Design a protein around this ligand. Structure first.
Ligand SMILES: *C(=C)C1=C(C)[C@@H](Cc2[nH]c(/C=C3N=C(/C=C4\NC(=O)[C@H](C)[C@H]4CC)C(C)=C\3CCC(=O)O)c(CCC(=O)O)c2C)NC1=O
Ligand SMILES: *[C@H](C)[C@H]1/C(=C/C2=NC(=C\c3[nH]c(C[C@H]4NC(=O)C(C=C)=C4C)c(C)c3CCC(=O)O)/C(CCC(=O)O)=C2C)NC(=O)[C@@H]1C
Ligand SMILES: *[C@H](C)[C@H]1/C(=C/C2=NC(=C\c3[nH]c(C[C@H]4NC(=O)C(C=C)=C4C)c(C)c3CCC(=O)O)/C(CCC(=O)O)=C2C)NC(=O)[C@@H]1C
Ligand SMILES: *[C@H](C)[C@H]1/C(=C/C2=NC(=C\c3[nH]c(C[C@H]4NC(=O)C(C=C)=C4C)c(C)c3CCC(=O)O)/C(CCC(=O)O)=C2C)NC(=O)[C@@H]1C
Ligand SMILES: C=CC1=C(C)[C@@H](Cc2[nH]c(/C=C3N=C(/C=C4\NC(=O)[C@H](C)[C@H]4CC)C(C)=C\3CCC(=O)O)c(CCC(=O)O)c2C)NC1=O
Ligand SMILES: CCC1=C(C)/C(=C/C2=NC(=C\c3[nH]c(/C=C4\NC(=O)[C@H](C)[C@H]4CC)c(C)c3CCC(=O)O)/C(CCC(=O)O)=C2C)NC1=O
Ligand SMILES: CCC1=C(C)/C(=C/C2=NC(=C\c3[nH]c(/C=C4\NC(=O)[C@H](C)[C@H]4CC)c(C)c3CCC(=O)O)/C(CCC(=O)O)=C2C)NC1=O
Ligand SMILES: CCC1=C(C)/C(=C/C2=NC(=C\c3[nH]c(/C=C4\NC(=O)[C@H](C)[C@H]4CC)c(C)c3CCC(=O)O)/C(CCC(=O)O)=C2C)NC1=O
Ligand SMILES: CCC1=C(C)/C(=C/C2=NC(=C\c3[nH]c(/C=C4\NC(=O)[C@H](C)[C@H]4CC)c(C)c3CCC(=O)O)/C(CCC(=O)O)=C2C)NC1=O
Lengths: 161, 92, 103, 150, 160, 177, 160, 164, 160, 160, 161
């Protein structure tokens, strides 16, 4: 659980160095994007339910996982999805603010693909839901902010794959 | 009853762990993990082994798996030992 | 290297393929006669991909978690002013734990 | 006897400003003629997977309509009267049109339905097949010049 | 850092950061470079300052320098300046990530049992940091030393 | 064909976006440098008869096998059909510099030009030389660094228009390789 | 494993249910060049016929953990996850799964699943091979078909 | 794509001519008139959700018969495709103020419109009442300048004269 | 069913089944002949029970079908009746299982999360099931209508 | 407020307040002059912010005011605007407290239980607050509209 | 944890179809034996201690697992047996009522043979004990009821093997 400042400190700190000018380029670089990330995390908090409603209607409530036998049939199973998609849109918001995807694999990615295989959750439909959820998130926060929030979505999709 | 009554945001009981477990669920995992305490050096309690492997139920695996990472734990392996998959009726 | 200015754009014409069709004339032909090719190169001229595309994962950092702490392997800049040396050295370790330096 | 190759028709047609897939006629690199077949066969191969990839998607659209057809025709002879809407002496409100940006980029992306959504899915296949029925053309066609200029 | 405290503190309640917290990130990031400009001032004065710290920690406490004390001898005193160097290096981390965790996840948590197993008197180390803060005021003007003052006395509060 | 204004329109029609404020400012700067561009294309179409005689004689002056019996520019009739290929390539660059886009170069000038050149038996590399001599002449009039003709202009510098007209002559030579 | 990844069946045998896979070694797949078995299986090499490839692969997954020691002179059948019954027979220390003739006894897997190596590929019982892609043919004339239909006066024997 | 540039390049390419002094003189009028029409193009790009909503229900408050069964406003997908079309037309007026000619309204909005609106049974007087509502609510000092109103209204009744 | 949760009840308590549990498994299986007749009535009356079910639902809730309602147009109204066909199916399961255990883990657990996340008024779908109940109990005698209606109102209770 | 939960945070952790906590109580009280001006704008604009707030709410949700809607008639519509006056008041508290803590324990905790138990569409009241937000941010500059709107959308988030 | 009715409903539901004639055909077959299973589970509840006392005395009472060194020597170890045999006779009673052995592997079989190998419990002596316990259970409940209760005993013995 490190942000961009924590990761910069650490690489300063695991080797025991001080904070040298080249290391600060990302930081003088992280503080520049500090204004963009909060407004990105602002609108995502507002439209959390609307984004997840847009992603599932655009990706998978259109393929027989929604129908009987599919992986999402029963209401408990459907309700687990939007609960499950809420974490991806939420933890991706944390990575967008912290500027470092360490929180994702710390709290989301580890034991995740090993868990979906246990339950039998289709990883293929999961990533396309997150991809569609990434597509709507670029709608709200804009282009570059969508590039930032989108940079952690595919990080989840990559490791979850 | 079950943990999905209608609770979500802005509801009277506090926003918390919501598991997709049915009424009296009978599915349980076999998990394995280490979980260093990260609090013994200002509490000075006795030490306990942190590497555990145990059967957690499906009713409360998500809360436990959500909490094991809360305190920096790492999950080495989990399986669904007891229970079916894609089973509409019968998880009870 | 493209050193074949000796071979222009008339290399593989293969002028002597000859078909007699009996006792009459030799019917000379210049059919090109391609190989059992396949032209083994990667990353060709276009993308050829619809998305179905989230394949990217970071490399394994050993026992810790990926990218969480590659902190031993970093470029870095400055050391400090006093800095007593090690004098036992115990192997370079590798990864630090499920852990980080900011505990 | 000889079919006309599709790159020889593209040379005859006058040029439009907007394509879905603008051509790499000038953007193919000067590699050895083998290399413009190891990039043209791949385009036909990559394109033909999408054509059969539009075939498992079309069988899922046909299975999604049969899933809801006992209820799609069972609600077709019900009396569904709304509360506001279709005529001018009642209120409605926004709904005399629509309100403030909520019509969408297309119109079918709002308009929900199970059947409809897969159909908007097809654009991420059939338009994406588009461009590809189009990378094996200029691999062939540049290819055509190569086996004509030789 | 400060954003990490907001992501963590908002994560145990299962919610996005509220209106007040996003202020706390936004105001922290707008004061960004001034910490960056400040740490480069202190890094250029680390050989400045630790030489002044060894001034008064030992004229105050000649017990440690004398034969019999822990710091008696060359190589014992050699690392003695190294502990100042690591502490001053840690404070540059704390001045940057605008909170106390780099001074707390390192250095403070369990420091007494470290020193007690070393023989260093834990009261003497408190005066060493208090000596170090006394030394930083001279090579620093009045504008920015009260910016760095609350990061020092947290260490003294942590060590007691 | 398109120009510099309808390239912004067909790139925003693909997104169904109105032409906003950011890409209007790149178009508002096109009009503010518009008097430079009309001053630029007036320099090339005033000297266009000397340029196609300095080009295809200097291509012959480096390649003397083109006038041997068995050459492309051997006879008198084929020499006029290379002089006509000087001033059509120079004409369609002059439309492309005036428009601010390379649409009229792409779908009219280079459309079918290579396939004609295969079927006639035109030397491929000698057409790259004569186009690039006209690239060496065109930037000599935009930067006013011509040797024996000086033209009078206003005070300023037009190093961006000379780079844009240099990229049009490389697009001619890239299509007939 | 490659056919599983391409065909999408590999998601099914990812699941935690106790399965008894009868995965054939690639010598079995290399032994698919029978003159006989190439008739009913070569058509799957076409890239549109992924449809039958999933069932034919799904016939190798057995719900349950049937170890070879659990087949001591026992003949029990079961249907696959493809949907059609398969008879596992274990007699005289030699096990069978349809036309399997299992090579390697068992491989312990993650979710209490077992893996047996078979010598051939089990085709499902009521599996018909997909026909090759053909030509949609249309009748050239219309008067050669009215003449092909028997009139009512013909059906009663009134005419020849 | 009828601009000032393409109408004088294609004139000079037809006679085999270099761009002469009559060609460059007309681009000076493209410089001198762009300040009036790009001011209307930026007011349209920053206000368009409120001007096609107001013109979109000028259609539906005038013609209440479209909401009838079988008629041309009957379900919600049909009303949402009506406001999409006013948004398509006001985007194409905005493209015509950028290029300086009627080209994007020509090839993308008008060519083939009377065949489509007749086949799909869409009343083209209901299109005109949306466009003429926008042409008559324009207040020439409040909303733009004076000579930006004469560039905005000129492309608006190019669309009314071609739709009917 | 009553058989499976009378077991898992006595399962948790480390004991066998009492006479109170075994005289009801006994009493339920003799009831099984009458249950299949009741479910057989609702099985091939879904055309009327659903279509007349959505009859009263729109007359009582015209908002949901009016322009702006969730089930507006030819599309959503078809799915508007699809859910009623679902819940009518689950009631046939509950009648044969002798309990709402099939209805519990299908269509009831977390149902408010789905319909809130779909934008559907959950109170509106509750009105739909009540309209189906009057049609269903009108198809059966009084002894049966105390059962078939009995499972609907449980679904009404959990759906709000 | 930011003062009370920065205390109860450091209260639970058995420690005092860090510089990260005390440089923000400091930063908040110097912000206090600007906060009262912002709340002073919304204080005597409730006549327009509420009445125009319910303006767009009925134009966007005519169902709730139409016959059958929850806010139908002269009576409910008055209470229909009363709740908007409540939530507009709580936003003035959150702006002066620098946090949604006043909005949290008033009008947000258990709000879905109230409105579900009143028959009111909770999504409808969320639409009402969004309409008030556009009126409120239209009354202030860009630097202020990033705050006054900032507290509304938190109320939008918790209200669904 | 599915009974015969739960398994029939699951398979009929997993294809999204109603309960056709074949699904109800097995359900009628289960209701016919509903009277037999309760009386079978009735007497087994009564003679639970007597059945286990008969099985151990008939299979492994005097063998040298009972003597010192054998796997059952100490009183804690002997007492664990009749505790252990009680589950087999109890869970088999549950399978006999539910008409489906899903409860056995859900709650008995999984991790069972892997547990006895850890403790070093002899699987060979365990299965006869269950075989002898199956033999006495056919004494009480009769022939066909013994066939039903016996059908789940060897299911335990098969998977435990
Ligand atoms: C052989 C006998 C022979 C050549 C070889 C070739 C020399 C040559 N010259 C140029 C460049 C130019 N020609 C230009 C045209 C004109 N220059 C003028 O002063 C008048 C106005 C006009 C003629 C009407 C211009 C402007 C140039 C550019 C530089 C310059 O001013 O000289 C080249 C091109 C260089 C290259 O290859 O890139 C060559 C080869 N001409 C011969 O007669
Ligand atoms: C030497 C490589 C051979 C061989 C050659 C001889 N061929 C003789 C006669 C002959 N050959 C052909 C075929 C040839 N002549 C043609 O006009 C054409 C094409 C139209 C071909 C392929 C014919 C038709 C004849 C005439 C046969 C006849 O009279 O019916 C020959 C005899 C002497 C001569 O005629 O030159 C020789 C020696 N014979 C050999 O033994 C070696 C292997
Ligand atoms: C090559 C050694 C032969 C020859 C081959 C050709 N076959 C052509 C078409 C063709 N072949 C098959 C059978 C093949 N395809 C399959 O999918 C399967 C397995 C199921 C097999 C065995 C089919 C079905 C077809 C298409 C039928 C048609 O459309 O006519 C073919 C022409 C197409 C092409 O070249 O790509 C050739 C040349 N023909 C020969 O003369 C040699 C001896
Ligand atoms: C609202 C004023 C009308 C109305 C609108 C409809 N138009 C429909 C289809 C349609 N309209 C166009 C022209 C439109 N598309 C464009 O790309 C441009 C210019 C850039 C314009 C003006 C097209 C090409 C189409 C067909 C494709 C489509 O669906 O968008 C339409 C659907 C037809 C139908 O379902 O019957 C409607 C509803 N028509 C009305 O019913 C009211 C009066
Ligand atoms: C009818 C046809 C027609 C033309 C030919 C031009 C003629 C022309 N060019 C410029 C004006 C100018 N022309 C140049 C051009 C040049 N300066 C250099 O150093 C380069 C060598 C050279 C071109 C490559 C520059 C730099 C300006 C000043 C920029 C400007 O006025 O916008 C001006 C002055 C514009 C003004 O007063 O604002 C005029 C009238 N305009 C026309 O309407
Ligand atoms: C914070 C990191 C994190 C994640 C991501 C997580 C996931 C997680 N997802 C679960 C289930 C589930 N997840 C899904 C999801 C889906 N079905 C589909 O078809 C889709 C592809 C997909 C939605 C995108 C379903 C249906 C279940 C229920 C499975 C069951 O009842 O068997 C469960 C079982 C317990 C429960 O939901 O209460 C966990 C623990 N836990 C975590 O701690
Ligand atoms: C990043 C935080 C951090 C600290 C501070 C740290 C301290 C530290 N101090 C040590 C020793 C020591 N430290 C001292 C220190 C002192 N004598 C005095 O009079 C002074 C007041 C004081 C120094 C300013 C002495 C005398 C020893 C040697 C004791 C011995 O080994 O006999 C040792 C044993 C090895 C070594 O010197 O490196 C450690 C690890 N490690 C850490 O990770
Ligand atoms: C077996 C238990 C069960 C239920 C109940 C269920 C419901 C369910 N309802 C859906 C949609 C829907 N449901 C409605 C329903 C209604 N509109 C109204 O006005 C009425 C109040 C109400 C019906 C009486 C509408 C309009 C949609 C489409 C929503 C959209 O397209 O955005 C969808 C998404 C499309 C689909 O896959 O069908 C699911 C999964 N799934 C289940 O597994
Ligand atoms: C400070 C936080 C807070 C809130 C929000 C609050 C709400 C509240 N809303 C009420 C009623 C009501 N609220 C509405 C509201 C609406 N109708 C609609 O169509 C709209 C969607 C919506 C308003 C925008 C209606 C119609 C009633 C009367 C319901 C009835 O008479 O049955 C009542 C009962 C009557 C009363 O005592 O006022 C309370 C207590 N109380 C609080 O302390």
């Amino acid at each position: 659980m490190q942000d961009a400042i924590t990761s910069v400190i650490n690489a300063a700190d695991v080797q025991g160095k001080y904070l040298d000018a080249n290391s600060v380029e990302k930081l003088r670089g992280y503080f520049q994007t500090g204004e963009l990330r909060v407004r990105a995390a602002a609108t995502i908090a507002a439209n959390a339910a609307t984004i997840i409603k847009e992603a599932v209607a655009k990706s998978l409530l259109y393929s027989d996982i929604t129908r009987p036998g599919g992986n999402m049939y029963t209401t408990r199973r459907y309700a687990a999805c939007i609960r499950d998609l809420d974490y991806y849109l939420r933890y991706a918001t944390y990575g967008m603010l912290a500027g470092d995807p360490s929180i994702l694999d710390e709290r989301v990615l580890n034991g995740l693909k090993e868990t979906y295989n246990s339950l039998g959750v289709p990883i293929g439909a999961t990533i396309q839901a997150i991809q569609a959820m990434k597509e709507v998130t670029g709608s709200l926060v804009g282009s570059d902010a969508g590039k930032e929030m989108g940079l952690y979505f595919d990080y989840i999709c990559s490791g979850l794959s | 009853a079950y943990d999905m009554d209608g609770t979500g945001a802005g509801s009277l009981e506090p926003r918390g762990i919501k598991s997709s477990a049915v009424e009296k669920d009978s599915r349980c995992f076999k998990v394995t993990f280490v979980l260093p305490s990260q609090s013994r050096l200002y509490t000075f309690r006795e030490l306990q082994n942190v590497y555990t492997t145990k059967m957690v139920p499906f009713s409360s695996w998500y809360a436990e798996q959500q909490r094991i990472q809360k305190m920096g734990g790492k999950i080495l392996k989990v399986e669904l030992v007891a229970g079916g998959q894609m089973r509409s009726v019968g998880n009870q | 290297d493209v050193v074949n200015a000796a071979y222009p754009k008339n290399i593989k014409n293969k002028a002597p393929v000859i078909s007699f069709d009996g006792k009459k004339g030799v019917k000379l032909e210049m059919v090109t006669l391609q190989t059992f090719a396949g032209d083994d190169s990667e990353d060709t001229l276009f993308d050829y991909s619809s998305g179905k595309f989230m394949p990217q994962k970071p490399a394994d950092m050993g026992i810790a978690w990926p990218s969480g702490d590659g902190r031993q392997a970093e470029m870095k800049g400055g050391k400090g002013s006093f800095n007593q040396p090690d004098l036992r050295k115990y192997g370079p370790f590798p990864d630090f734990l499920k852990r980080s330096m900011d505990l | 006897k000889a079919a006309i190759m599709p790159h020889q028709i593209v040379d005859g047609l006058p040029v439009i400003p907007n394509s879905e897939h603008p051509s790499q006629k000038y953007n193919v690199p000067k590699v050895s003629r083998e290399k413009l077949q190891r990039e043209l066969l791949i385009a036909q191969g990559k394109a033909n997977a999408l054509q059969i990839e539009l075939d498992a998607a079309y069988t899922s659209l046909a299975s999604s309509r049969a899933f809801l057809a006992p209820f799609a025709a069972m609600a077709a002879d019900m009396d569904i009267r709304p509360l506001y809407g279709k005529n001018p002496q009642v209120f409605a409100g926004q709904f005399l049109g629509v309100g403030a940006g909520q019509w969408g980029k297309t119109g079918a992306d709002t308009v929900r339905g199970r059947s409809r959504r897969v159909a908007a899915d097809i654009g991420v296949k059939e338009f994406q097949l588009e461009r590809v029925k189009q990378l094996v053309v200029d691999l062939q066609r540049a290819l055509a010049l190569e086996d004509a200029e030789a | 850092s400060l954003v990490t405290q907001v992501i963590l503190s908002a994560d145990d309640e299962l919610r996005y950061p509220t209106a007040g917290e996003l202020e706390t990130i936004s105001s922290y990031l707008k004061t960004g470079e001034y910490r960056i400009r400040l740490i480069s001032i202190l890094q250029g004065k680390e050989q400045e300052i630790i030489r002044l710290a060894s001034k008064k920690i030992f004229q105050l406490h000649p017990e440690y320098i004398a034969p019999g004390g822990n710091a008696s001898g060359a190589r014992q005193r050699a690392l003695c300046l190294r502990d100042y160097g690591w502490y001053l290096r840690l404070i540059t981390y704390a001045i940057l990530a605008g909170d106390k965790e780099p001074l707390e996840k390192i250095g403070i948590i369990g420091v007494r049992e470290m020193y007690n197993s070393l023989g260093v008197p834990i009261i003497g180390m408190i005066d060493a940091i208090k000596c170090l803060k006394e030394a930083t005021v001279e090579v620093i003007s009045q504008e920015e030393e009260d910016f760095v003052a609350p990061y020092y006395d947290y260490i003294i509060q942590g060590m007691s | 064909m398109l120009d510099a204004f309808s390239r912004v329109v067909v790139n925003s029609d693909a997104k169904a976006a109105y032409v906003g404020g950011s890409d209007l400012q790149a178009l508002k700067s096109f009009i503010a440098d518009g008097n430079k561009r009309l001053d630029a294309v007036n320099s090339i179409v005033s000297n266009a008869s000397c340029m196609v005689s300095d080009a295809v004689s200097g291509m012959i002056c480096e390649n003397p096998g083109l006038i041997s019996p068995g050459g492309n520019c051997y006879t008198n009739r084929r020499m006029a059909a290379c002089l006509r290929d000087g001033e059509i390539i120079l004409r369609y660059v002059s439309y492309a510099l005036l428009a601010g886009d390379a649409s009229v170069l792409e779908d009219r000038c280079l459309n079918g030009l290579k396939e004609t050149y295969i079927a006639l038996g035109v030397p491929t590399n000698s057409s790259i030389r004569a186009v690039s001599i006209m690239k060496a002449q065109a930037v000599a009039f935009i930067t006013n660094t011509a040797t024996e003709r000086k033209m009078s202009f206003a005070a300023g510098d037009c190093t961006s228009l000379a780079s844009e007209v240099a990229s049009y002559f490389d697009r001619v030579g890239a299509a007939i390789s | 494993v490659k056919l599983l990844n391409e065909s999408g069946v590999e998601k099914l045998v990812e699941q935690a249910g106790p399965y008894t896979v009868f995965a054939p070694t690639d010598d079995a797949f290399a032994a698919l060049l029978e003159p006989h078995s190439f008739n009913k299986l070569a058509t799957l090499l076409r890239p549109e016929n992924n449809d039958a490839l999933r069932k034919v692969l799904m016939h190798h997954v057995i719900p349950g953990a049937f170890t070879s020691a659990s087949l001591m002179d026992r003949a029990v059948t079961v249907k696959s996850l493809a949907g059609e019954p398969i008879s596992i027979m274990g007699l005289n220390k030699l096990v069978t799964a349809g036309t399997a003739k299992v090579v390697r006894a068992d491989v312990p897997c993650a979710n209490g699943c077992i893996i047996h190596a078979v010598s051939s590929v089990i085709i499902p019982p009521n599996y018909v091979p997909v026909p090759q892609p053909t030509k949609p043919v249309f009748p050239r004339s219309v008067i050669a078909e009215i003449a092909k239909l028997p009139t009512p006066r013909q059906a009663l024997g009134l005419d020849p | 794509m009828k601009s000032v540039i393409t109408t004088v390049v294609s004139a000079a390419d037809a006679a085999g001519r270099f761009p002469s002094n009559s060609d460059l003189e007309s681009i000076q009028g493209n410089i001198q008139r762009s300040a009036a029409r790009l001011e209307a193009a930026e007011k349209l790009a920053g206000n368009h959700e409120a001007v096609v909503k107001e013109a979109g229900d000028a259609c539906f408050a005038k013609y209440a018969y479209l909401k009838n069964p079988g008629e041309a406003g009957e379900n919600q997908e049909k009303i949402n495709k009506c406001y999409r079309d006013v948004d398509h037309y006001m985007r194409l007026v905005n493209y015509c103020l950028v290029v300086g000619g009627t080209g994007p309204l020509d090839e993308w909005g008008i060519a083939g419109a009377r065949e489509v609106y007749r086949t799909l049974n869409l009343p083209t007087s209901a299109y005109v009442a949306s466009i003429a509502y926008t042409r008559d609510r324009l207040c020439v000092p409040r909303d733009m300048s004076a000579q930006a109103g004469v560039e905005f209204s000129a492309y608006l009744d190019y669309l009314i004269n071609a739709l009917s | 069913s009553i058989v499976t949760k009378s077991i898992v009840n006595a399962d948790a308590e480390a004991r066998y089944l009492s006479p109170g549990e075994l005289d009801r498994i006994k009493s339920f299986v003799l009831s099984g002949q009458r249950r299949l007749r009741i479910a057989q009535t609702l099985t091939e009356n879904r055309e009327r029970i659903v279509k007349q079910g959505g009859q009263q639902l729109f007359q009582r809730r015209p908002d949901v079908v009016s322009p702006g309602g969730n089930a507006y147009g030819e599309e959503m109204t078809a799915t508007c009746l699809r859910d009623l066909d679902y819940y009518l199916r689950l009631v046939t399961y509950g009648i044969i299982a002798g309990d709402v255990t099939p209805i519990e883990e299908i269509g009831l657990v977390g149902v408010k999360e789905m319909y809130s996340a779909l934008g559907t008024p959950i109170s509106g779908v509750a009105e739909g099931i009540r309209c189906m109940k009057d049609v269903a109990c009108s198809l059966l005698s009084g002894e049966d209508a105390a059962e078939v209606g009995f499972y609907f109102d449980y679904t009404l209770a959990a759906m709000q």
